[PDB]
Design a protein around this motif. Structure first.
Motif, PDB file in Angstrom:
ATOM      1  N   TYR A  13       0.823  -1.205   0.000  1.00 37.26           N
ATOM      2  CA  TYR A  13       0.000   0.000   0.000  1.00 37.26           C
ATOM      3  C   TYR A  13       0.859   1.258   0.000  1.00 37.26           C
ATOM      4  O   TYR A  13       0.545   2.230  -0.696  1.00 37.26           O
ATOM      5  N   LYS A  14       1.945   1.254   0.767  1.00 32.61           N
ATOM      6  CA  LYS A  14       2.846   2.390   0.860  1.00 32.61           C
ATOM      7  C   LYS A  14       4.272   1.921   0.613  1.00 32.61           C
ATOM      8  O   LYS A  14       4.595   0.739   0.756  1.00 32.61           O
ATOM      9  N   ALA A  53      -3.836  -2.729  -5.950  1.00 34.32           N
ATOM     10  CA  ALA A  53      -4.752  -2.702  -4.814  1.00 34.32           C
ATOM     11  C   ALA A  53      -6.132  -2.201  -5.228  1.00 34.32           C
ATOM     12  O   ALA A  53      -7.151  -2.825  -4.911  1.00 34.32           O
TER      13      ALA A  53
END
Ligand SMILES: CC1=C(CCC(=O)O)c2cc3nc(cc4[nH]c(cc5[nH]c(cc1n2)c(C)c5CCC(=O)O)c(CCC(=O)O)c4C)C(CCC(=O)O)=C3C
Ligand SMILES: [Fe+2]
Length: 306
Positions: A13-14, A53
């Motif tokens: 995600y990051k 995602a």
């Protein structure tokens, strides 16, 4: 209410997530600083992070909607279970269990079966259910034979080829690929390679492209042989032998634009076609297109009817 266990690989995600993600992929063995640096470089080369995602999420909830809007025999509830990042396969099963779901159908967002891919997905989901005491997991192993799946890819290839001068269609080749695996799977009759061959065969029969070939991509950093030929190497060989002028890449083993397409195809394959002087073509991935949602809706309902 029947839970819809939609499973996929997962993606950081990051940028902070890259390390634990690679560690999970490597079965808990933390990668060296050099391997992390290469991976982060590849994410950086495609813009920073993968859209996997958001695509995966639109796929899962688009399917839930597609199934629920087309009938009223049952209400589906989609739960996302990722392989290498949260929410994990086991988190989805736990979520289903605490939510009271008694039965569920599981589907992997990869049309082909293999001991390394779908089997691992199905194993972890069935183990989490057994431990929890529910829900009953009715697993779909593969779905590449779904007629609408084959037709969706042939339509994409046909749309691209229609923009190739008839002068050059005879010099156009379709490259069908999926994620490579250790070659040893062939020693034990793993269906993965033959399912990909069948997929390429079926697509070829329905497209105007007169040439094609089966390749693999994204083989891992190990010390063992992997399924070949690699799409880069295959591209060179095919140009050396036939001097093809157009290369159309369909990595039908994947269902979304992500790292293994945006880098392994749109960069590394493009580099090769550039080197030999050929055109690069890579039709859009299925992503969350209605046609693809219709593919998945048909597969799940067919599985429910059974
Ligand atoms: C069969 C298969 C699929 C089919 C599809 C599915 O199952 O859904 C798939 C999909 C994907 N694999 C992905 C990413 C990665 N896979 C890796 C590594 C590996 N994959 C493997 C297999 C597969 N992978 C294997 C046997 C390894 C070697 C492990 C080791 O070394 O022991 C590595 C590590 C570094 C590298 O090898 O480059 C990464 C970063 C992403 C998303 C990337 C993103 O967008 O973030 C997707 C969709
Ligand atoms: Fe992978």
């Amino acid at each position: 209410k029947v839970g819809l266990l939609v499973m996929a690989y997962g993606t950081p995600y990051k940028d902070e997530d890259i390390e634990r993600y690679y560690t999970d992929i490597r079965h808990g063995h933390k990668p060296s600083e050099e391997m992390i640096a290469d991976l982060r470089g590849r994410y950086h080369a495609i813009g920073g992070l993968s859209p996997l995602a958001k695509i995966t999420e639109a796929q899962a909830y688009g399917l839930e909607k597609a199934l629920n809007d087309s009938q009223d025999e049952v209400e589906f509830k989609a739960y996302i279970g990722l392989k290498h990042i949260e929410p994990f396969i086991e988190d989805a099963v736990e979520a289903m269990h605490k939510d009271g779901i008694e039965e569920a159908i599981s589907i992997v967002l990869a049309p082909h079966y293999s001991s390394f891919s779908v089997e691992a997905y199905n194993k972890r989901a069935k183990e989490a259910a057994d431990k929890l005491g529910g829900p009953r997991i009715n697993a779909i192993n593969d779905w590449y034979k779904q007629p609408k799946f084959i037709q969706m890819w042939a339509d994409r290839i046909n749309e691209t080829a229609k923009q190739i001068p008839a002068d050059e269609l005879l010099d156009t080749v379709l490259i069908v690929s999926a994620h490579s695996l250790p070659e040893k799977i062939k020693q034990h009759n793993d269906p993965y390679p033959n399912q990909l061959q069948e997929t390429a065969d079926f697509i070829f029969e329905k497209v105007v492209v007169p040439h094609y070939a089966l390749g693999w991509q994204s083989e891992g950093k190990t010390g063992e042989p992997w399924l070949g030929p690699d799409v880069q190497d295959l591209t060179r060989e095919l140009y050396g032998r036939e001097k093809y002028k157009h290369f159309i890449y369909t990595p039908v083993g994947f269902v979304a634009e992500h790292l293994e397409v945006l880098y392994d195809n749109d960069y590394e394959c493009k580099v090769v076609t550039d080197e030999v002087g050929a055109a690069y073509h890579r039709p859009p991935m299925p992503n969350s297109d209605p046609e693809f949602l219709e593919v998945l809706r048909t597969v799940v309902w067919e599985k429910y009817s059974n």
